[model samples]
Target: AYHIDEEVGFALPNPQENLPDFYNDWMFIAKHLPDLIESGQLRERVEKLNMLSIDHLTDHKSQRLARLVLGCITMAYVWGKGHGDVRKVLPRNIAVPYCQLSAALELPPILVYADCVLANWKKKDPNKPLTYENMDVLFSFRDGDCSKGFFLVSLLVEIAAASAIKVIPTVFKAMQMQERDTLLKALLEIASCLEKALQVFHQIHDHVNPKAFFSVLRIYLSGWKGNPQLSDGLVYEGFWEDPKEFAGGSAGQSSVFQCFDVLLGIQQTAGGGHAAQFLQDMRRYMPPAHRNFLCSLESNPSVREFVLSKGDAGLREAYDACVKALVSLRSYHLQIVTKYILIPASQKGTGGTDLMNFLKTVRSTTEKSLLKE
Candidate 1:
């Protein structure tokens, strides 16, 4: 049941060599989509597949595929948290099935990992742990290793997740904002983490030779569908295993703005017309569970009522602290744009200005603009 050691974490499974059909079957079955939140059939099939021993799952492709399905399900489950207000997250149809499946896999939910990793516990409560200010040190923790190229971006992924999944919820549930209480402390923790992560990302930019990552190794991490020989379906063939599986996107920043918007009653329409619409569309690129979950929180009516009753005078300083932390995060993101996207575009390379402009437009929007003062 275990293949881990003190030095190496969960040992990487053998390289997925013949994944051509695996991708096809997965897409075919997954067309059911998680949008039907009220329906639970997709949950059923994924659970059924999860019932096998991973080591014994060679013929049916059940082990790896089941894990993939489980992750998607995890995203859906987080969406159901509904901003910590709604308790009845998933129906029995989805919940019990998910419970057994998670048990069978012997792994906790992704949010559980997200929650535990970010919040350094004082009194042994992972669910309600406090944010740590030492997160900046993680930037160089994995530095100077040969795998430095991957770990730089990899750690940042966790840094962002802990903020969005664990820290944000803790702040929201604190139910009161103040100058130096748990809420203020937690916001400061996140700000510290983002600042630290920016240092790590800079390490990554210097580490990766774009000739190697963007051109050479990029093919291993992406899917293609245009060639006539592959039968015109999305073809993903990565035989290289470790970092190959970590084909991640810019999702690290996805959760931040959505939470910021909802926490303070900032509306999408409060921003640009089409530009806001474009930012809104970026929601779809995020994990479906988070994307739909944020949709569920279109406006936290109860929270809004509270914020208004207190007047901006009450929550003003603390709320501004939240905004300030987030604005600082965006500023760091702009630096990334300048180096990764903007600089590349200026050099007539493939990186585009769209992302940089997106960041600018979002910052200029009404909610973010308020922070300008």
Candidate 2:
């Protein structure tokens, strides 16, 4: 069965070292992205970039670095001039390697959470732990520190959930053995971990200015799917014959909440409409290993069933605590998104779903999962 990594959890493991010489052009473009975009030279600079070989990216970190670099450049090229002058076609040089990296990583060619948040960050001080002040993004859009804070906040949330991720298999095994006490302890740990995740999530307000996040940074995160700006999607010249569409980088693509959903048996109904469908679709954007771990959880019986069948007050309370914590986390996310995304523009989410209603529905569904007393 797939188990989450105990060491790094979902955040990309290992501080990123520099890539090999072959990736210099890609790295250069990513490094100078803000300058290029500002001067309106991004398209021309990207056009001149050498088509690099994905074959050289044999290691896991290299492959992920390649994905982040290419994905950021691709999004900037399409949406850098803002949505009004959106570029319809990705040139062959950028398109080809970007497609190749996507194939190797099993992520969409478009930027996703894995590209922007999970794999995007590094430590400012080599010896220090990853704190908001200590961590920063390797590549950034024009929003600079705000972009760094945005990605860093998400990374910290993933870190906060590390123990919950690690305890998943233990909970599963305890349930299999019908060890109620062990299961209870594990559930408490998960709840505690989720509370920590919620705290880290709140730090977004301190780090990001809502106006800048909404107006300046949000466009780069927007994708081709469901976007009014690119109704037909985008063309990856020489890679795909027809226009290819993908959802933009969104927190919906994060595995943390989905792990909680499956572990607690919170069935986000496909019948719930586009909100559910959109979340299920976001699974395609998760790192293959993380997605596999989610599948492993789903294949097994959920802890919720054990709590129900046993009818133990302690077990039910423990299970409900996890649910409550998960619900609170979602609710806080709604508040943050409402501030950063909703109040500013009253627009659709970067993932192109109906924003506020979608979040509210998911939060409501999570609340409904609490075992009845």
The lDDT values for all models are 0.38, 0.85
Candidate with top TM-score is 2
Compared with the true structure, what per-residue lDDT tens digits does model 1 show for residues 1-373? Answer: 2221111112122212232443443333333333323354443444344222233334323433344443344333322212222111333333343344344544332222211111111222335322232121111111122223533344444444344334555555655443236655665565565455445545556555544343322221221112121223221112112111111123332444565566555555445465466556445434334555566556434344454456555345555655565566567767755654455444511111145556666565534534337
Q: What's model 2's overall lDDT?
A: 0.85
- Candidate 2: regions farther than 4 A off: 1-3, 143-145, 269-272
Lowest lDDT 10-residue stretch of candidate 1:
134-143
TM-score of each: 0.47, 0.96
Candidate 1 lDDT score relative to the true structure:
0.38
Q: lDDT, candidate 1, residue 77? A: 33
State candidate 2's TM-score. Answer: 0.96
Cα displacement (Å) at residue 228, model 2: 1.6
Note the residue pairs that clash in candidate 1: none
Residue-level lDDT tens digits of model 2 in 1-373: 3435575588887646578987888888899888999999988999887777789887888888888888889988998768488899999988998898898888889988987898888888869987787777888988453788888888888888897888987898998888878999999999999998888888998888988898888889999997878898999998999998898988899899998999899988457588789888999999898889888778898678778888699999999999999888888888888888778886588888888888888999899988863
Worst 10 residues of 2 by lDDT: 1-10
RMSD of each: 15.0, 1.6
